[model samples]
Target: GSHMSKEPRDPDQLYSTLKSILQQVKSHQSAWPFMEPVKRTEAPGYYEVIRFPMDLKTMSERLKNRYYVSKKLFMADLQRVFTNCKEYNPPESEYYKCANILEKFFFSKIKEAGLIDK
Candidate 1:
């Protein structure tokens, strides 16, 4: 028999087990812009403006590696991704608007999931 000590909370695993709630965000079109990894050269100075880019793919990798050890950390990427979108784009830009919608939608579902208290 092999033995490993029990790990408490296991935040990343928490989300993995809780994907029925989290995956709703993945299916939302509001989260579309980040479904793919951003191309460094294609966007031309894209990274220059937003030094760190976060995507659904990026978060996926984080979860895969157990990078989210806190409840807030799991949801942190949603805020970060939307913030990046709004920061680099104009108010009139769809991504900017999408950022607002997605931000709201994310919280809506987060609340729905009881991830936070309203």
Candidate 2:
């Protein structure tokens, strides 16, 4: 539990350091495929908001009863739109921006689903 409550010297530095790690990891991870619509399962009541393998569905649904869930489905529609582009470099800013987009996407869907707003 060494990291249970430790604070970094500077949050901006910490974030930049982590961002570099993320970019390296992303480049090597197949889960970050350019053209694939991925689905991740969540608790029975809510969806998991991250990208995960589709295989964990049953266990996820089983353990979902007691937990609020949120599902994340990455729509690879951008892949089709950007197919003609030759340079394939995702800007560092897009990482965080994409997260915000996903957050909005989930919330919008939840709202449309008549979920709580607050």
Candidate 3:
């Protein structure tokens, strides 16, 4: 028999808990291009896209099953990407903007999936 895990199970914590939990779930569930949107095409091959940017890769890896989940999958400035990915230490305005974009993108994917799933 599998043991049931117990942690932050406060019903009062549902809304707040879900805000964080669902993000992680969706991030893991998302694919590369979309999951790691801040792509890069470096030298050598002349054309090769790295799906996961440094910040996103680091964040997803570190925060997996913890708190917060990546929501955007669009390529942007490498450094700026980290700026958004930091979750803290940056201006509130930037975080809100970046996070909003990611959130919209995430929901859009969800809607698209439902359409394609059927």
Candidate 4:
């Protein structure tokens, strides 16, 4: 609720943010085995678009219903979820540990994607 001001107003900025988070989610499949491993036959760029996890249909539904086709809105939702998880989960819990890693990975990827200031 307190993250409204941090939300990206531009669609392109929001797109990069969402894609970066999703990429982190996908890349951390090994740490969270419930998430299916992304098919690696192709280059990472080939999977750059918003590809839903075949194993996690709920993820797709949540984004579709909650977003209602608004990229900025979806990005805001992602940030809220990330922030809440980071705050509420116990530091010793695996979820808390993995989420921190994902958050760092997301930031690193954003830097590599040339949005260091974002």
Instruction: Tell me how many residue pairs clash in candidate 2.
Output: 7
- Give all TM-scores, in the order shown: 0.72, 0.26, 0.25, 0.43
Weakest ten-residue segment in model 3 by summed lDDT: 69-78
Tens-digit per-residue lDDT, 30-116, candidate 3 = 223224444233222212332333445443444444343222312132233433344332345443455555545644544432211
Task: List the candidate 1 regions with Cα displacement exceeding 4 Å.
Answer: 1-13, 116-118
The window of 10 residues in a row where model 4 has the poorest summed lDDT is 48-57
lDDT of 2 by residue, 1-118 (tens): 2542232234343333333322332343221332233223322211333223222222223223412222211112222212211122233434334444443443454344333224
Worst 10 residues of 1 by lDDT: 1-10
Q: What root-mean-square deviation over C-alphas does model 4 reach?
A: 11.7
The digit string of per-residue lDDT tens for model 1 on 58-93 reads: 676666666654556656666778887887776677
Question: RMSD, model 2, all Cα superposed?
Answer: 17.4
* Backbone clash count for every predicted candidate, in the order shown: 0, 7, 2, 0
**Candidate 4 lDDT, 1-118, residue by residue in tens:** 3634444446555554555456556656423532543344432321333233222223445444433234434434444344444444445556456656666765665445444333
Which parts of model 4 have CA positions greater than 4 angstroms off? 1-17, 30-75, 115-118
Model 3 segments more than 4 A misplaced:
1-55, 58-91, 115-118
- Using lDDT, rank the candidates from best to worst: 1, 4, 3, 2
Model 2 residue 64 CA deviation in Å? 3.4
- lDDT-superior candidate, 2 or 4: 4
Query: Candidate 1: global Cα-lDDT?
Result: 0.66
Against the reference, the lDDT scores of all candidates come to: 0.66, 0.29, 0.36, 0.46
